[PDB]
Amino acid sequence: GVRWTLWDTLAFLLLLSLLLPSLLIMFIPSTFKRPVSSWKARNLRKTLLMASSVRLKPLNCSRLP
């Protein structure tokens, strides 16, 4: 048959609506899936975060025995 009680319909609709976002990704053009400009922003983030201000300073003298 078909789900009868209001609880049945509510549960089925809730589960479908929770699986709905993963299946409406089908209709999203790839451009909106990952804009190229924002990808360049993430690449900038990776490079900048890789940057470290530690930078070799000169040494007065070496250690002694």
């Binding site: 048959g1 078909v2 089925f12 589960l15 699986l19 976002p21 990704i25 089908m26 899936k33 990952r34």
Partner: protein
């Protein structure tokens, strides 16, 4: 197949009778999947590099020791074939549910394979055309769901469970096909988003596979099925074997798939694992448990949908990027930290779902 050969050799040596017990089969399947993945890894990565890039390469820092230049993006073959071999060796081949899971896994794996190959050799900007990819995904999912419904017509196999209510459990009839479509294809496409953070997709996948193994073990026994109040599917006894095989394959891939990944999983592995998880959640009446346990997948898909909805209606951005883990990445969280935080979240939700099924 070896279990059949164990039934054959038991008559000559009683020692082989140990191969029949479920626990030994599960543990040995896990170990064999891990060992085959480990054996294949170093050869597969080098071979893929030759295909993808120059024949001779070697890690150098920081341009490749801590960065991901020159890393192949076709390593999902490891997961696919490890799962296939472990299941087909240590799982009963006469059970139709194992065959169903394997065929779904193989179909999604070949789709991912052709997509990755289109991207790595022909360098097409669109890669695999969306229409063909999605058409094949849909034909596979709809055929499998139709076969399962025909098998389970007017039979508890077509019922729907609810995490916190026991008495509500309708018989979906033809809507079983629609539900199978939604869970299989949705999780197959949701695991695709999760691949973009250097192993964010191998887990939850592993923890979810373990939870599904436990559920199938409980589901496959009359006493445990009655105590937990789950529909009883005799063939669930071998679904646990496939779940342990998936755990083994995922851990074997994570062997080489940690920051910095020696190989990206790609579609060949992501689609394979997502389809395997969705199909397992179909044969086991555990769609809600997949939703609860796989919170990262559903959250990333909801995040992309919500970001495009914002772009359409408001024009603002709810999250800096469509995948929410990438939004955290932009916030400042480094990949090694976001990946493990999402692993924490996935494990927490897996335990929460297991407890919820414990209580119902």
């Amino acid at each position: 197949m070896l279990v059949w050969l164990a039934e054959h050799l038991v008559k000559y040596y009683s020692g082989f009778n140990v191969f029949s017990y479920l626990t030994f089969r599960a543990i040995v399947s896990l170990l064999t999947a891990l060992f085959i993945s480990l054996w294949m890894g170093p050869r597969m990565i080098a071979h893929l590099q030759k295909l993808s890039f120059g024949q001779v390469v070697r890690n150098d820092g920081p341009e490749s020791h801590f960065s991901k230049r020159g890393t192949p993006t076709m390593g999902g073959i490891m997961i696919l074939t490890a799962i296939v071999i472990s299941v087909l060796l240590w799982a009963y081949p006469s059970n139709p549910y194992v065959w169903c899971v394997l065929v779904v896994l193989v179909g999604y794996g070949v789709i991912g394979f052709v997509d990755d190959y289109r991207k790595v050799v022909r360098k097409d900007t669109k890669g695999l055309i969306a229409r063909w990819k999605y058409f094949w995904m849909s034909v596979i999912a709809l055929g499998v769901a139709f076969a399962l419904y025909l098998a389970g017509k007017d039979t508890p196999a077509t019922q729907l469970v609810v995490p916190f209510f026991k008495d509500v459990m309708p018989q979906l009839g033809l809507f079983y096909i629609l539900l199978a479509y939604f869970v299989i294809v949705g999780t197959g496409n949701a695991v695709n988003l999760t691949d973009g953070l250097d192993g964010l997709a191998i887990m939850p996948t592993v923890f979810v596979a373990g939870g599904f193994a436990l559920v199938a073990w409980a589901t496959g026994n009359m006493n445990f099925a009655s105590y937990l109040h789950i529909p009883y599917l005799r063939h669930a006894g071998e679904l646990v074997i496939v779940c342990t095989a998936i755990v083994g394959a995922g851990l074997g891939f994570l062997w080489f798939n940690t920051y910095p990944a020696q190989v990206f999983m790609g579609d060949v592995g992501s689609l394979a694992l997502g389809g395997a998880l969705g199909i397992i959640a179909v044969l086991l009446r555990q769609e809600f448990l997949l939703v609860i346990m796989g919170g990262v997948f559903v959250v990333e898909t909801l995040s992309v949908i919500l970001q495009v909805g914002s772009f359409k209606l408001r024009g603002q951005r709810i999250f800096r990027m469509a995948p929410i883990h990438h939004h955290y990445e932009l916030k400042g969280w480094p990949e090694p930290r976001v990946i493990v935080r999402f692993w924490i979240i996935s494990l927490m939700l897996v335990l929460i779902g297991l407890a919820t099924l414990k209580v119902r």
